[PDB]
Write a protein that binds this ligand. Sequence first.
Ligand SMILES: Nc1nc2c(ncn2[C@@H]2O[C@H](COP(=O)(O)OP(=O)(O)OP(=O)(O)O)[C@@H](O)[C@H]2O)c(=O)[nH]1
Ligand SMILES: [Mg+2]
Lengths: 49, 292, 387, 151, 99, 49
Amino acid sequence: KRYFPENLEQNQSAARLVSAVKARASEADISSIHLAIAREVSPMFNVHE
Amino acid sequence: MLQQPTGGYTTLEQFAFTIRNDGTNATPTQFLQLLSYEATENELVKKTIPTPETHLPSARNVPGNVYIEDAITQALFGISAQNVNAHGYFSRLSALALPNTSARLGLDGVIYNSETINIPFYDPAAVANFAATYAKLGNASTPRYRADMIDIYAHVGLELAGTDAERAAGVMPVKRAKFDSWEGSLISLSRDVVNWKILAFLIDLCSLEGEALRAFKTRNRDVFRMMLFIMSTAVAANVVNRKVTKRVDRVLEYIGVNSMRTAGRTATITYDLSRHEFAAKFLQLTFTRWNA
Amino acid sequence: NIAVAHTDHLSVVYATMSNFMLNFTNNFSGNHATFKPDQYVITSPEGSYKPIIERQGETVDGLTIIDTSIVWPILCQCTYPLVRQSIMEEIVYPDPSTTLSQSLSVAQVLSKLTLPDAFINMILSGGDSVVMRTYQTEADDDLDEGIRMTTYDQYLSHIRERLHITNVPDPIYITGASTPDQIAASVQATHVAVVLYQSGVINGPASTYLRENEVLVVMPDYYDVVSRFANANLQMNNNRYHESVLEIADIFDQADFIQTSDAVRQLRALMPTLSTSQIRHAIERIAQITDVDSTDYGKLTLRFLGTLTRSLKMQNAQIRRIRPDGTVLRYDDQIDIEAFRWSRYFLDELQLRRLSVGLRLITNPRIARRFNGVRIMYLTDDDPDPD
Amino acid sequence: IDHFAAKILEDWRQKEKLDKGALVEADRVIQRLIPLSSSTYVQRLAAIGALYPNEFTENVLDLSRLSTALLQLSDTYYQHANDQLRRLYRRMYNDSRTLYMTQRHQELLLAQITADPNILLYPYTYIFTTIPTSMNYISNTGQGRIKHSLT
Amino acid sequence: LAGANTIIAIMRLFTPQGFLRTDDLAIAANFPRASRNPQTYIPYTNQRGTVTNEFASRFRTIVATLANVVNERAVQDDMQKATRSCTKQWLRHLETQFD
Amino acid sequence: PVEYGIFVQRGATYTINAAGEFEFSGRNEKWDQALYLSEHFPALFSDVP
Ligand SMILES: Nc1nc2c(ncn2[C@@H]2O[C@H](COP(=O)(O)OP(=O)(O)OP(=O)(O)O)[C@@H](O)[C@H]2O)c(=O)[nH]1
Ligand SMILES: [Mg+2]
C-alpha cells in the first residue's frame, strides 16, 4: 500500500486524517478491480446504486 | 620599440578589434548594427562624472613581469575572473608613469621591469601618459577612492544605446537591447572581446591629442561601444531570448542600469563585487578621457 | 550568580556557532510580534511544491519537542567555568577543524547528491508541452501556418507558472479593440509569445500580426472559435485546424532556466516517449553508474538522512518563498537571495561551462554514427564502397 | 511601512509649507525615506510619497490609517486616468532607489551644497517636473454632517 | 450561479477527461447495437507529448483546488487545525502517486 | 478574568496586514503549531496595548 507519504502515517497530528483514509482504503482484490473496469463498459440493466 | 603612428596604435592592422559573427571576423561596428533597442518608461540622465583622484597607487616592489593586459581584460570581460582586488597588481601600471623609467610595456601586454630583447613595446612617452591615468585602476578597491558604480552606467547606456539626439541631450529612455543571436552569443562575444589588445586602444586614447585624437574617438567609437556592451550585459538585470518565427532574438535588459547582481548565470559573464568596483573605476577613468 | 557566566561566556559560543557553515537560516529578529521564518519551497511547475519548513511531525529522534523545564537546571543545578571563579578552570577553545570538516563533509555530500537527477531534468526541461490547435487563416497554408491557440486550462497548467518563475507581467487580454502594437508590447514585456483571448471579434490586422509572429492566443474554450475572429478573408474555418504538441522549449528560452540549445533538442528527438517512471529509472541508472566519492562522515550523514528522494517533482524546479497564506511568490530581486533566481538546474558553474563543450561534442557529425533507414535493391557488388 | 508612512506625512506637510512659500526651519529638504531594499508595498509608498499628490493637500485621504490610504492612493496612481501621473508613478516604482524630487527642492539642495561644500547627501536622484491637476476636491475630516443646498 | 461560484468550481473537478469514441469497428462488423448511432465515452486518451501527461496534470489542478479548499476551511479545534495541514500534505502526495 | 475577556474578545491571534496594520481574529481559538507557518501570530505577543 502507498496511501501515505513517509512518515505522516507515523505522525501524531495526522491520526485523524490517517484514520480517515484507512476508512476508505479498500484492500485490492483482482476480481473487484476487473469488475470495476468492466462495469465501466458493460450495459446496465438494473439501475446501479 | 613600436613607433606610434600619427593615428593611434589602433590604426595598425596588428591591433584589429573584431568579434566573431556569422562565421566571419566582423568588426564591432557591424555587430552593433544588429543591436536594436526597446525604450521603456524609465529615463537615464547622465550626472557629471567626478574627477578621478590625483593619487597614483604605489607599484609595490614586484620582480616579476606582470601580465597587465590579461588582468584588465579579464577583470572587465573575463568569464571566470573573481577577487580582482586581492592581488593588487594593477598598481604596477604606476611603475610606467615615471619619466625615463627602465620599465616598458610590451605589446604582449606585460609590464617588463627593464627593456628586454625581441619583445616589442609601446613608446614610453605614450605609455607614461596612459599609466598616469590608468594606474588609478590600482585604487579601484581602496575605500577612499572607489568609483560610483550606479550612476556611471547611465553614461554606458548613452554611449551604447543612445541616439545622437539622446547623446546630445544627455538623457535617454532606459532601453532594452536585442539582436538576432546564435547559441551562447554573449559568452562568445565577451571572449572575442577579452582577447582584444585593448592596451592599444587605451594608449591611443591617452597619448593622442588634437584633431588626431578626435579622429580616434570616431574611428574607435564602435569598439568602445562593444566593450560597453559586454560590460552592460555583465550588469544587465536579466537576459532572455525570444522566439521570433524560427529565429531567436537575445534581449538584455536593461542598458545603463547596473543591477548590482553577483550571482552567476549561463547567459553572460558575471561581476563579483570586486569586479563591480573595478569596472566602475575603469569606466570613470575611460569616460573621463573620452570627454575632453 | 549564574548570569555573570552566561552573558560573558555562552554568548561568544552563540556568536561563534552563528558563523558555522551549515547554519544558513536566520533564526530570529528579536521582535516576537512580527517575526516569522522565511518560507522557501522547491516549487515545480509540473508538480506540487515541497516546503522546506513543514510540520511533517517526524521527530528526528525526538529533536522537535521542547522541554521548557530545562531552564530550571540551568538556573539551578549546573555549573560554568566562569561561575566557579574560587577555582579557575581555563576556558576551552575547541579546534575549528572538527565542525569545519563535518560541515565540509555534509556540504560536499549533498552537493553531489542531486547530480544525476539534476542532469536528467536539465536535459528534459524543455520537454514539457501543450496541445495546441493551429487554424489556417488563408488559402494554401501549410498546417504549421496560421493562428496558434491553446485552451486556458493548458496555459494555466503549464505556461502560467513558468511565467511566474520568469518574473514577467501577465500577458494581455485581447478584446478585438487590440492594435497589433499593444500585442507586440505584451510579447516584449513578457518574452513568451502569448496573449490571452478575452471577448469580442478580433480585427484582421491583429489576426495577421498573431499569424505572422506565431503569437499563441489562449482561448477559454473551443466553441465556435471562428466567431472570435474577423475572418474577413473567409478562409478560416471551425473545422480547418491542426492539433499538435508544442514544447515549452519552443516558447520559453531562458538560459539558466530551460535548456534549449539545439544539441539538447536534437537529443530530445531521439528520446522515446517518456513517463515520470521512465525518467526516475533513468536517473537511478545514471546514479548507479557514478558511485560518488565520500568521506566516512559523509557516508554517515548519507545513511542518517537517509534514503528516498524520488517523491519530489523537479522538472523546472525553482526555489521560491511562499506567502504564509500559501501562495507561491515570484523571486523578489530585493528580498530573496540572488542565488535563488534560477536554480541553474541545480548544477555547479563549472559543470555548465563543460556542459556547453559536451553539447558541441554530441552535435558533432563524426560521432553521428547511428544510421537511419535502408534501401533494399538487387545490384551486383562490383566495386564496393560504404559511402 | 509605518516608518515610511510617517516620513511621507512629514515631507508632505513640509512641502505643503514650502509650496505656500513661507520660510521654514526644515531639517532637510526631503524629509521622506528612500528604500534601498524593501518589499513591493514600500516601493509603492516611496512612489506616491515622491509624487506629492494633490489628494494630500485636498485632505482626500484619511490619516487614521495613513499607510493604507497611501497604498490605495498608489493603486489609483498605478492606473491613473492621467497618463503623465501614471507613467510618473510607474517610473518612480521601477527605480525606487533613486530619490525623485521637484526642481524647487533641487535648488534648495544646491543652496545647501553651496553653504557646506563637503556635506553628504543622497547621490542617486531624479528631478521630475510636477504634473498640475485642476480638480479641487472638497474635504473636511472631523465631526459634522454636510447640509447640502442642491441647485 | 449568481453567488455559488465555489460550488460550481468544485463541481468542474468532476468533469471527465476522455473523449466520445463512436464504436467504429462494432458498426463495421454489424454487431448488435440498440443506439441509433453507437458510441462510448473513453475515460482518457494517449499522452500526446514526449513528457507531460494531460490526465496527471488535470489531477494536479484538482488537488491544487482541493488544497485551496482545505486551506480556506475554517476550524476551531486544534486537532482540526492540524489535520487541515496534514490533509494538505497528503493531497500533495496523492498527486505524485497519480502522476 | 476581566482583562482576559477584554483581551480575548480582540482575538487569540492576529495577522499583519499588507498595509502593516494588525488585524486580530476576534475569536478565542486554541493555538496549534500548524498555524506557526500560517499568517497568524499568537495575540499575547502582539505587544499592542
Ligand atoms: N507600483 C504599483 N504596482 C502595482 C500596484 N498594484 C498592482 N501592481 C502591480 O501588479 C502586480 C501584482 O498585482 P496584484 O496582485 O493584483 O496587486 P495586489 O497585491 O493584489 O494589490 P491590489 O492591486 O490593491 O489588489 C505587482 O507586481 C505590481 O507590479 C500598485 O498599487 N502600485
Ligand atoms: Mg526627525
